[PDB]
């Protein structure tokens with residue numbers, strides 16, 4: 001067992017706040033924002049040895065990353081940015097930093113009660129997306 005075990009499973013989106021504005025800050029175009037904002041993804045998190053896999057599954061699009069904590073990887077985001085990403089565990093929080101074109105955004109995942117809370121931040125704009133077990 002590992003601390004990361006509290007994340008593993010299949011999670012469904014139950015609430016979203018400020019996501020359109022977060023996407024605007026990131027640079028997502030209008031049509032993608034509208035379709036993304038309508039999505040109700042499932043988030044599937046699994047671990048095999050040192051490799052963590054996170055899959056986001058929705059209508060329109062499925063995206064999946066696999067990574068080792070602390071080890072940078074190149075990532076194509078759901079909005080088609082090519083970014084360089086690093087994910088670490090900081091005091092029980094999974095912290096995902098994405099860098100591209102001199103910009104940065106951070107996505108944090110935290111277990112709070114029976115929820116998986118996702119906080120997305122770009123400059124001063126935060127979006128909070130709450131998932132529950134499917």
Ligand SMILES: O=C(O)C1=C(C(=O)Nc2sc3c(c2-c2nc(C4CC4)no2)CCC(F)(F)C3)CCOC1
Nearest residue numbers: 023035036039041058059060061078079107120129
């Ligand atoms: O997993 C999340 O809740 C999180 C995110 C999420 O779900 N984004 C989703 S789902 C989803 C899409 C996007 C999306 N994002 C973005 C920019 C903001 C990054 N452009 O498109 C597009 C296609 C889809 F078919 F509609 C399905 C993004 C932020 O980090 C947590």
Ligand SMILES: [Cl-]
Nearest residue numbers: 069070088089
């Ligand atoms: Cl780490």
